[PDB]
């Protein structure tokens, strides 16, 4: 198989205005929503058939419950982090937890927090340590590494947990995580003269785009873009790059997406 | 379906050195606690294993091996305030912890 | 520094006859938990109260019901006693469910016989 991942995301919101919920959590495999719970609705629900298709209605019943209580302590711990900032108005807590089945067979897996937007504590899980930015954070650490068996609960469920419920998510999705749609590529003339190479309708999202000068690649010069949700399930991508009108070159490009490479000739 | 399983009962001298065995086989596995209950009382916290390998604590200890899904507690110097019931718990991929029927340690003076 | 706190130690009912345990935990822990031990098995959960505010079903919820009246309290009612429900009754807590290494404490237990 390619290389996927499953993970698991969470946000909290110190003071929301009326309509946002103060925290939410939702879970991915690769690039797909599979789960959601929010602090409004106070359930567990799915986001992708294959996940309501294949989990018993007792496995929405007990993450309910799980997230319910899991969402008062990212309160609790909110409370505690803006406390200690002596910071006024709404600020936000998030923590993303996760693992990744790489093509080789091999695993890695992660845990971090964030305040505001910035990196809070990252795990190590070779170390069993929590690297703290600020003092605020190194607080937290110390508190967190007093508990040793904690330190080694996260280390088996980032590597043994983790992989088993990716594998068994991507047995129950495998139509659509483990399908292939090749890109359909072109190459277009715009004055802004630069040369654009387009490619769209492809699935998995990830792929390579560049462009080479008489074989040679320098990716000073090219311009790429990001890679863009077509809304049916496929994406689309490009890149640019400027033309010399006082010598002549010949440009190419290079497009690899799931074991294929693509050169267009201009 | 999931199941732990720990001898019903055990006998050993005062003094002695006695391991008591707990095999399970759940769905996942977030860990292993002993609990520790005297006749009568409530179950106490003794200890808990995540990854393989023996954790000392006093006169008891607790071992795991994963693969082999299987833990004991180990108490050495055995003294008669050890005559208790052990109780062996696995949380599984859900966090809900199955229990074993425990062993009930009875020592001889 | 009460711990867990659940009454009363013993009771006997009649057959039909209802009854409320009490529960009260003093260590700001969040998830409590109601249990039942019978001679030859391993525990088996009632319900529970994941957090303040909420409850649920565990493995043997028939013929009983529980309210979360506040963070500490939570208490486990029997509305028509069966002979069935003669077991030792236990209330347990801990700080947070779902967290891996944290344990349970657990109150002195409520001894229950129902006759006919």
């Known amino acids: 198989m390619r290389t996927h991942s499953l993970r698991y995301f969470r946000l909290g919101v110190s003071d929301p205005i009326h309509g946002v919920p103060e925290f939410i959590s939702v879970g991915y495999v690769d690039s797909h929503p599979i789960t959601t719970y929010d602090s409004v609705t106070r359930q567990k629900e799915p986001r992708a058939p294959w996940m309501a298709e294949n989990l018993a209605p007792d496995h929405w019943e007990r993450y309910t419950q799980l997230l319910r209580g899991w969402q008062q302590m990212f309160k609790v711990e909110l409370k505690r982090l803006q406390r200690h900032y002596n910071h006024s108005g709404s600020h936000t807590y998030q923590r993303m937890i996760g693992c990744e089945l790489l093509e080789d067979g091999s695993t890695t897996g992660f845990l971090q927090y964030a305040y505001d937007g910035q990196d809070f504590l990252i795990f190590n899980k070779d170390t069993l340590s929590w690297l703290a930015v600020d003092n605020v954070a190194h607080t937290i650490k110390q508190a967190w590494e007093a508990n040793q068996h904690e330190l080694l609960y996260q280390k088996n469920w980032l590597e043994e947990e983790c992989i088993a419920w990716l594998k068994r998510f991507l047995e129950y999705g495998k139509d659509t995580l483990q399908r292939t749609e090749p890109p359909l590529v072109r190459v277009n003339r715009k004055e802004t003269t630069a040369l654009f190479c387009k490619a769209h309708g492809f699935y998995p999202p990830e792929i390579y785009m560049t462009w080479m000068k008489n074989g040679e690649e320098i990716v000073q010069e090219i311009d790429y873009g990001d890679i863009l949700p077509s809304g049916d399930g496929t994406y689309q991508a490009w890149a640019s790059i400027e033309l010399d009108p006082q010598s002549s070159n010949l440009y190419s490009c290079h497009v690899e997406h799931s074991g294929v490479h693509m050169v267009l000739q201009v | 379906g999931q199941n732990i399983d720990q001898p019903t009962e055990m006998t050993a001298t005062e003094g002695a050195i006695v391991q008591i065995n707990c095999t399970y086989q759940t769905s996942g596995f977030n860990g292993l606690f002993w609990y520790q209950q005297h006749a009568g009382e409530a179950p106490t916290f003794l200890s808990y294993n995540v990854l393989d390998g023996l954790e000392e604590k006093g006169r008891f200890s607790s071992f795991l091996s994963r693969s082999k899904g299987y833990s004991y507690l180990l108490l050495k110097e055995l003294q008669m305030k050890d005559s208790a019931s052990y109780l062996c718990?696995?949380?599984?991929?859900?966090?809900?912890?199955?229990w074993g029927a425990g062993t009930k340690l009875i020592i001889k003076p | 520094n009460a711990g867990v706190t659940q009454t009363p130690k013993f009771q006997v009912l009649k057959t039909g006859q209802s009854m409320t345990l009490q529960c009260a935990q003093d260590m700001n822990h969040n998830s409590m938990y109601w249990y039942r031990q019978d001679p030859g098995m391993g525990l088996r959960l009632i319900y529970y109260?994941?957090?303040?505010?909420?409850?649920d079903k565990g493995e043997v919820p028939n013929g009983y019901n529980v309210s979360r009246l506040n963070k500490r309290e939570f208490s486990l009612r029997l509305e028509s006693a069966a002979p069935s429900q003669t077991s030792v009754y236990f209330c347990?807590?801990?700080?947070?469910?779902?967290?891996?290494?944290?344990?349970?404490?657990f109150g002195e237990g409520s001894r229950l016989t129902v006759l006919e």
């Open positions: 109260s994941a957090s303040e505010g909420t409850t």
């Open positions: 347990a807590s801990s700080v947070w469910t779902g967290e891996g290494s944290g344990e349970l404490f």
């Open positions: 718990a696995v949380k599984d991929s859900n966090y809900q912890l199955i």
